[model samples]
Structures are given as C-alpha cells and as structure tokens.
Target chain A: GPMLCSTGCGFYGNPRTNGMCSVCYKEHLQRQQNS
Target chain B: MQIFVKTLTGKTITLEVESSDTIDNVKSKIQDKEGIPPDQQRLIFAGKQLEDGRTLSDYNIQKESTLHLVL
Candidate 1:
C-alpha cells in the first residue's frame, strides 16, 4: 500500500518508501539545507 | 521539440525531448528535475494518460502542449 502526502499538497499518489511525496520530500530536503 | 510539464503543485518544468523519445524517457528527465522517480510519475496529455513505451509522436504531442504530472 502507498501512503498519502503528509503535507496535504493535493498529491494523491505513492509517496515512495519515505512516506512523503517526492515534491514534498524534495522541498523538505531543501528546507533542511537552507536552515 | 519541447514539452511542458505542470506538476501537481502547479510548478511547471520544461524539457527538451525529441519526437522519438518515449514517455519513459521524459519521466527520467522529470526525475532529474523534480526528484520524482520515473516509476512514480504519471503523465497526462490532452485528457489521455500516456504510457511509457509510447513515443511523443505517437501521441501527436505538439510543441508547447502542456502535460500534467501526477506524482
């Protein structure tokens, strides 16, 4: 089974194994780096 | 030719792809741009879902045609 995006960005698809959608996960990583 | 992909978040990414390029190849390009894996990408164009093995020309995709990306 696939997980929904925790960010609620209207992305309804497989979130890979990270439990976050690719867009959210990528943005999260970027935020982590900038902070 | 050029193809435009509008992601679910409304972010648009443009890619340079040849007419011979398969949908799978375009997905690879999107993977590079958005960190979305190819297998996880679904491309919709002109109200039809594109399959990986099909070429852009097979779909008759034109220049500046917008493809919706679902990830």
Candidate 2:
C-alpha cells in the first residue's frame, strides 16, 4: 500500500507530500525558497 | 517502472519507481544520489516539463521513457 519517495531517500513516503519524505521535502523547500 | 535520467553532464542513469511516483520524488532521489538540489533540476519528458505533484503516469512515463534533466 506504500512506496519509497521520489528521492527514494530510502524512506517510504505518502502521496500527500508528493511522494517525498518529510526530511527531503523540507530540504527541497528550503533550497527552493532561496533559489 | 524504471526511467532514465539524461543529465547535462551527458551521463544517463536509470531509476526505479512506481507508475504512481511523483516527479518531486524522482528529483529528490537524484539529490540523494547526486549533490544537486531539487530546485536546480527540471525533468523534461515528451518536450514538456514535469510537475512535482504529478505522477510519472500522469506524464506518460513508461519503462523505456527517457527524461531530460536540465538546470
């Protein structure tokens, strides 16, 4: 019923976070903010 | 499903994913493997840019589909 994230960061993620783990998603957000 | 990522470096690598995997997840996977940030990458398939919330299936990705990774 679940799968690893887009980053496949080795952690399973949900669809709500766009299939990314929170850690990776937040890091992505941080980079996006400053980009 | 598995798709290939052709980067600006001229190196293409294959990634494992499900049909329902989001574009965001794929970029993150690359960040994990490479040092590149997700925001620095854009995945282009079929001459169109892929969106984060959209699944590979939504972008018509298949086993042999090759995606272009651009900055």
Candidate 3:
C-alpha cells in the first residue's frame, strides 16, 4: 500500500525543504534569541 | 538490492544493511538496534501508527522500504 503522510509528516510547523520540522531545533534557537 | 533502515527517533539505526535482508526486514533490525524488543515494537506505516494487531506485512511494504516505528 502506498503510505499516506496522514499528519503532513507530523511536523509541529511548516515543513522544511529537508522534510524535517524545526520545532525541536528552532525552539532552542528561539529561546537563545529571547535570552 | 540495497536496503537502508532509519529509526523512529530519526537515527540511522542501520548504517550498513545486510545483503540478505531487504529494507522491510531492516526495520525490525533497526528497532532492535535501538533496544526495542520485537514484542514491544510498534510499526508506523502510511503516516499513521499501524493498528495494534498489524505488522509491516499488512502494509504491503516492498524492498528498499523505510519504516518508522514507535516502541
């Protein structure tokens, strides 16, 4: 069966060109930015 | 045929695959490498986690397949 990306790849936000979401990585960066 | 296996946590569990094993078979081995016992492994195919009673075979997975499992 052809698999379906049921949750749009399950990303917390928009998907990157690399197909990976930055929620985990970006959150760290965002925290640094705020600090 | 060449097979590759990736883990649920997005790790390259199997950097070097066995020639005798297909990509589908590598999924199980990948979980094993991640310390997931076969009895406790949960297959995630078709974007959704497979039903508790399902296996990779139920998804009709083919060679060179890549599966993400949640154990």
Candidate 4:
C-alpha cells in the first residue's frame, strides 16, 4: 500500500502513521507529548 | 542550534535539528545517517531519558549541548 505521505514530501506514508511516513510520525508523536 | 550526540563507541555525531523535531525524529535521522535503527538508539540528555514522544524543546536543549546515546 503506497500512498503519498500526508506529511512527508519524499517518503511513503502508511496507515500505521495516519498517512505519514515513519520519519514524519516521529515529529507528530513529540508534538503531542509536549502538550 | 547545534547538538552534539555522543555514543559509547567514541563517536561524536554533530547534527542540528528543528526545535520542534521529536526525539523519535532525531533517532530516525540518526538511524539514517549512522545506520543504526531507531529501536537501538537510546537518547539521554540532562540526566533525562529522551522519550521519543517528546521534542528537543521539551528538554530545553540548547546549542552545543551534549546528548548521550546508549545502545
């Protein structure tokens, strides 16, 4: 399942990351933790 | 701001990242450049475990700060 990453410009996104690539997912996780 | 990450293998990794970047993203960047997997990276800064869910700003990291990495 290859899809355009919702947050990534150069990588594929996955459902496990809500349409974000693993790299982008990392940033997302931290953004929430700080809240 | 530049952060220096040191490993037990006598390597000092010099990299700068956005303050908004998560520790997980840091680990991923480390993985990409150092060929070390994210799961294998353990970031410790200022005597605190750098949780993947937190950003650099969460720890108040500054320029030239040193981050410890344990495998």
What digit string (tens of lDDT, one per residue) describes model 2 on residues B39-71? 888889877787787667555476888899888
* TM-score versus the correct structure, for each prediction: 0.64, 0.64, 0.37, 0.65
Q: Pick the candidate with the highest TM-score.
A: 4
Candidate 2 DockQ, CA atoms: 0.03
Residues B1-71, candidate 1: write the lDDT tens digits.
78789877878899998866878998998888878889988899767787786666545566788889876
Candidate 3 residue-wise lDDT, B1-71, digit = tens? 33344555677443444433433455556555665555675556457664433333334444576656565
Instruction: Give me candidate 1's interface root-mean-square deviation.
Output: 11.0
* Order of the predicted models by lDDT, top scorer first: 4, 2, 1, 3
State residue A27's C-alpha deviation in candidate 3, in Å. Answer: 52
Give candidate 2's TM-score: 0.64
Cand. 3 TM to true fold: 0.37
Which pairs, if any, clash in model 3?
A: none
**Model 4 ranges with Cα > 4 A deviation:** A1-35
- Pairs that clash in candidate 2: A6-B25, A6-B26, A7-B25, A7-B28, A7-B29
RMSD list, candidates in order? 14.6, 12.1, 15.3, 12.8
Model 3, residue B42: C-alpha shift (Å): 1.5
The C-alpha stretches of model 3 lying farther than 4 A from their native spots are A1-35, B1-4, B15-32, B51-55
